[PDB]
Amino acid sequence: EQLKHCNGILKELLSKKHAAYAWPFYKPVDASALGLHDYHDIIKHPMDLSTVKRKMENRDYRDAQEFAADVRLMFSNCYKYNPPDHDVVAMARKLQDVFEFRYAKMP
Amino acid sequence: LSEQLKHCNGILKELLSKKHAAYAWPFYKPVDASALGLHDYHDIIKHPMDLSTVKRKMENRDYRDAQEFAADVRLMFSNCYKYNPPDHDVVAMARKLQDVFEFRYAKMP
Amino acid sequence: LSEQLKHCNGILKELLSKKHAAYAWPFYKPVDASALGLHDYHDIIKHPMDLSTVKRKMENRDYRDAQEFAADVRLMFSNCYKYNPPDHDVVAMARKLQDVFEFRYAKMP
Amino acid sequence: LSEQLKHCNGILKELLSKKHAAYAWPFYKPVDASALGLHDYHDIIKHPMDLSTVKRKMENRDYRDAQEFAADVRLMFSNCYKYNPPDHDVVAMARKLQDVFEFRYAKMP
Amino acid sequence: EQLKHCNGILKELLSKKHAAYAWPFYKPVDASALGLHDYHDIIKHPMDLSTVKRKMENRDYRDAQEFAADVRLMFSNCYKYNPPDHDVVAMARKLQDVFEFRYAKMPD
Amino acid sequence: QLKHCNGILKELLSKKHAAYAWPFYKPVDASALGLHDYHDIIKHPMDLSTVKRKMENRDYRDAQEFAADVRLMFSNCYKYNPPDHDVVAMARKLQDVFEFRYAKMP
Numbered sequence: 001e002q003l004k005h006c007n008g009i010l011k012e013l014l015s016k017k018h019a020a021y022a023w024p025f026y027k028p029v030d031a032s033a034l035g036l037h038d039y040h041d042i043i044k045h046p047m048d049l050s051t052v053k054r055k056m057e058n059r060d061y062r063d064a065q066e067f068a069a070d071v072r073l074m075f076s077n078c079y080k081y082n083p084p085d086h087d088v089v090a091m092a093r094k095l096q097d098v099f100e101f102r103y104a105k106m107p
Numbered sequence: 108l109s110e111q112l113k114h115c116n117g118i119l120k121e122l123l124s125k126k127h128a129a130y131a132w133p134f135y136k137p138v139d140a141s142a143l144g145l146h147d148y149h150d151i152i153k154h155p156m157d158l159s160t161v162k163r164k165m166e167n168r169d170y171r172d173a174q175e176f177a178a179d180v181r182l183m184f185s186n187c188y189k190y191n192p193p194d195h196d197v198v199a200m201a202r203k204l205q206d207v208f209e210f211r212y213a214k215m216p
Numbered sequence: 217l218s219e220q221l222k223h224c225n226g227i228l229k230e231l232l233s234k235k236h237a238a239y240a241w242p243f244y245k246p247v248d249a250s251a252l253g254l255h256d257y258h259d260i261i262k263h264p265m266d267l268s269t270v271k272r273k274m275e276n277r278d279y280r281d282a283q284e285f286a287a288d289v290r291l292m293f294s295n296c297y298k299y300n301p302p303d304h305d306v307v308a309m310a311r312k313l314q315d316v317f318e319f320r321y322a323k324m325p
Numbered sequence: 326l327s328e329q330l331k332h333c334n335g336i337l338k339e340l341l342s343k344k345h346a347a348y349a350w351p352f353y354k355p356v357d358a359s360a361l362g363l364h365d366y367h368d369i370i371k372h373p374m375d376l377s378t379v380k381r382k383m384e385n386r387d388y389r390d391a392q393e394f395a396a397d398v399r400l401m402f403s404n405c406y407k408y409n410p411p412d413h414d415v416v417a418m419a420r421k422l423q424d425v426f427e428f429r430y431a432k433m434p
Numbered sequence: 435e436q437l438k439h440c441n442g443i444l445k446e447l448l449s450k451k452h453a454a455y456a457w458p459f460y461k462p463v464d465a466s467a468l469g470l471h472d473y474h475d476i477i478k479h480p481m482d483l484s485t486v487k488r489k490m491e492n493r494d495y496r497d498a499q500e501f502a503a504d505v506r507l508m509f510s511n512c513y514k515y516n517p518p519d520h521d522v523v524a525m526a527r528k529l530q531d532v533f534e535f536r537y538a539k540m541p542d
Numbered sequence: 543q544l545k546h547c548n549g550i551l552k553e554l555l556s557k558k559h560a561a562y563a564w565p566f567y568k569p570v571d572a573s574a575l576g577l578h579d580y581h582d583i584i585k586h587p588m589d590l591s592t593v594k595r596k597m598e599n600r601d602y603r604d605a606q607e608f609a610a611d612v613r614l615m616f617s618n619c620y621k622y623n624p625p626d627h628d629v630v631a632m633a634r635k636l637q638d639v640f641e642f643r644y645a646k647m648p
């Protein structure tokens with residue numbers, strides 16, 4: 001019902017129409033490759049879109065509250081780790097604007 | 108003690124080494140659950156671990172002492188025993204590498 | 217024909233799918249000779265191949281036709297049969313994945 | 326000389342090193358045209374290149390000499406300068422990393 | 435709880451981030467290996483970060499006022515002993531700027 | 543013979559040369575100093591305490607092997623570091639001491 005609407009939002013963000021600011025969230029942050037030593041000291045529960053897609057197909061979200069929480073966690077990790085100036089916070093805010101809007105229009 | 112952790116580093120070095128490649132490789136990187144088709148991996152294993160992550164944590168100074176380092180390596184083996192049935196090959200490789208580990212950890216001065 | 221490279225994509229997508237993961241995983245990436253201790257690997261295997269390489273070449277559109285695609289995927293399997301003894305798990309996995317390959321290739325328009 | 330391939334290996338190891346990670350990351354893997362929505366990338370760029378590929382070729386021993394390595398590492402940067410307009414972040418990161426490359430290549434016995 | 439932030443502060447003094455200027459303060463001053471035959475007459479109470487670490491883990495510190503006072507003892511000990519010119523005074527200066535700030539940034 | 547050598551060691555380790563010998567007393571602690579690349583660049587680590595451990599062992603059969611290891615410790619420090627860092631200056635001040643007393647050996 002609403003779970004089915006949550007897919008279409010998850011699809012809409014994984015979609016290519018926001019790929020220009022959605023890309024830093026398609027896969028988990030690679031702290032090793034990015035040479036980020038403290039990423040996991042600071043981020044207790046990483047999240048990213050692929051990991052949301054995983055949990056969707058396993059049916060690990062019962063409600064939309066659990067789905068929105070992981071998507072919001074993905075964004076909060078980014079706002080937590082990074083300083084406000086960084087270009088990844090600006091794309092998180094653009095992608096989050098897309099999400100919150102699409103989530104608000106849920107029946 | 109820094110002597111402990113220096114020796115723990117030595118153990119980690121020995122687990123990653125050439126000589127145990129045959130049975131250590133399954134633990135060089137996190138379990139790629141999506142690549143392996145393992146839908147229920149991260150519902151069963153709350154706290155993944157591997158030797159890449161133990162090197163990272165050690166390099167990062169996340170290990171207060173030798174016990175913290177052992178808890179992780181041991182956690183890596185227990186997840187492997189948790190997720191898998193006893194007769195899968197990966198359980199037999201854990202046990203050989205765990206046997207390398209417990210010995211070296213036991214012999215630590 | 218772009219039609220037959222279209223079908224080579226399906227073949228690959230199929231080879232890479234969760235369906236076959238249990239025997240497909242060792243061809244997902246190049247053989248890491250370094251990590252696995254294989255000092256003679258690159259002496260014996262002059263032209264390594266694996267499925268990520270194949271995919272990269274596909275997205276690159278480096279395959280002039282389906283025969284080129286097929287020659288790489290078979291090079292992958294022959295590399296494996298050339299290097300390993302015939303009892304090794306990887307050989308039995310290769311034959312498992314190659315039966316899938318030789319079937320979907322064979323049943324292409 | 327495989328002595329000059331040794332140094333190119335040092336160069337690569339250096340380009341991949343954590344020091345340059347803030348500007349090297351876009352070249353760590355091939356450009357994902359699908360994921361990024363670049364429906365004209367493969368029309369414009371005929372021979373894509375990135376550092377993973379270079380490493381795989383180095384391990385495969387596909388490079389006859391240092392010149393050949395350099396042509397690939399340079400194809401990576403040109404490809405980037407060709408596709409993108411000059412204002413884009415990624416052109417600025419290319420030039421930054423290419424400065425490390427051009428320096429280290431030049432300091433070669 | 436304020437001792438929980440203190441421990442976070444100590445975690446940062448010890449991290450790779452400050453390792454070009456914090457290393458003099460990881461172990462106690464080894465006066466005899468250094469040939470500092472006066473150190474222990476001038477510095478009646480040595481301090482260093484591994485002693486702060488080890489005191490945290492016995493719960494030696496009753497409040498933040500006490501954890502602060504040892505990190506500061508460690509810095510004063512450096513300033514008390516050395517000439518203003520020496521490389522190690524600068525390094526304590528630098529690391530103290532990291533301590534004084536993160537201690538100030540403590541919620542209360 | 544190595545009594546001349548082991549007397550050279552006691553002198554390098556002693557208090558007279560501590561203000562420039564201090565970085566060579568124990569092995570280089572690359573983790574505590576934050577040097578990821580140190581052990582890939584310095585294959586064979588060396589330091590004076592380890593030189594003392596090799597001696598007590600009676601592993602140094604002949605004086606060249608003692609000299610190659612004191613020299614290696616120094617050659618590691620020149621190999622790893624740029625010339626203008628302080629620790630290359632201190633290595634040079636200690637190797638001056640080492641060399642002008644190893645040269646005066648029967």
Ligand SMILES: CCS(=O)(=O)Nc1ccc(Oc2c(C)cc(F)cc2C)c(-c2cn(C)c(=O)c3cc(-c4cc(C)c(OCCO)c(C)c4)oc23)c1
Pocket residue numbers: 023024025026027028029030031034035036077078081082087088346347350414
């Ligand atoms: C698709 C997952 S990935 O494979 O790990 N790829 C990836 C690539 C770039 C990322 O961050 C950016 C982004 C998004 C834009 C940019 F211009 C530069 C960087 C480094 C990021 C990235 C994502 N998120 C969510 C983050 O929170 C952060 C933080 C950082 C980051 C990276 C570096 C190197 C940093 O250090 C720069 C100076 O040392 C800092 C402060 C933050 O990078 C990301 C990720």
Ligand SMILES: CCS(=O)(=O)Nc1ccc(Oc2c(C)cc(F)cc2C)c(-c2cn(C)c(=O)c3cc(-c4cc(C)c(OCCO)c(C)c4)oc23)c1
Pocket residue numbers: 132133134135136137138139140142143144145186187190191195196197200237238241305
């Ligand atoms: C180096 C990390 S990696 O990039 O993800 N590579 C990797 C590769 C193979 C792994 O497991 C093996 C191993 C080790 C041997 C083998 F013959 C087959 C498999 C699947 C494993 C693997 C490691 N560990 C620690 C595990 O606990 C498990 C469990 C499983 C696993 C995989 C599959 C496909 C399974 O399904 C079999 C039929 O469905 C089961 C039951 C378990 O795989 C691993 C990992």
Ligand SMILES: CCS(=O)(=O)Nc1ccc(Oc2c(C)cc(F)cc2C)c(-c2cn(C)c(=O)c3cc(-c4cc(C)c(OCCO)c(C)c4)oc23)c1
Pocket residue numbers: 128129132196241242243244245246247248249252253295296299300305306309
């Ligand atoms: C995703 C590629 S990877 O990152 O390099 N990971 C990987 C992991 C395991 C591999 O091989 C297996 C496989 C498939 C199953 C198994 F139970 C044990 C091993 C070692 C192999 C592997 C793949 N292929 C295609 C091979 O031909 C061979 C050969 C060998 C291999 C490995 C070791 C350690 C070997 O030595 C055994 C005892 O010294 C031998 C003889 C062969 O491993 C692979 C690769």
Ligand SMILES: CCS(=O)(=O)Nc1ccc(Oc2c(C)cc(F)cc2C)c(-c2cn(C)c(=O)c3cc(-c4cc(C)c(OCCO)c(C)c4)oc23)c1
Pocket residue numbers: 019020023087350351352353354355356357358361363404405408409414415418
């Ligand atoms: C690790 C390879 S990856 O998995 O494909 N990830 C990746 C991530 C970011 C990339 O480029 C950046 C970078 C580096 C920073 C940034 F703030 C935004 C982008 C898009 C790029 C990237 C690399 N190179 C070499 C390129 O030439 C280009 C070009 C583009 C690109 C992307 C988008 C969305 C673009 O916008 C299309 C219209 O909206 C344009 C014009 C170019 O992205 C890359 C790649």
Ligand SMILES: CCS(=O)(=O)Nc1ccc(Oc2c(C)cc(F)cc2C)c(-c2cn(C)c(=O)c3cc(-c4cc(C)c(OCCO)c(C)c4)oc23)c1
Pocket residue numbers: 457458459460461462463464465468470511512515516521522525560561564628
């Ligand atoms: C990691 C602790 S340790 O095992 O005991 N090793 C150690 C190593 C170097 C130390 O100080 C430095 C520093 C930091 C930089 C430098 F270029 C030289 C020295 C000697 C110091 C050191 C730390 N602190 C906090 C100090 O206050 C002082 C003072 C001195 C010191 C040492 C010597 C040899 C001194 O020279 C005596 C004249 O021959 C003087 C005047 C002061 O060294 C330290 C300690």
Ligand SMILES: CCS(=O)(=O)Nc1ccc(Oc2c(C)cc(F)cc2C)c(-c2cn(C)c(=O)c3cc(-c4cc(C)c(OCCO)c(C)c4)oc23)c1
Pocket residue numbers: 453454457521564565566567568569570571572575618619622623628629632
């Ligand atoms: C007694 C063994 S110990 O316990 O590991 N202690 C120790 C302490 C200081 C050392 O080097 C100095 C010295 C001597 C003075 C100084 F002000 C700063 C450092 C880092 C060194 C040291 C010794 N030798 C032999 C070296 O070659 C090097 C190189 C380095 C070193 C350290 C840092 C932080 C460096 O900076 C990294 C970039 O910021 C660089 C480039 C080199 O430190 C030592 C060692």
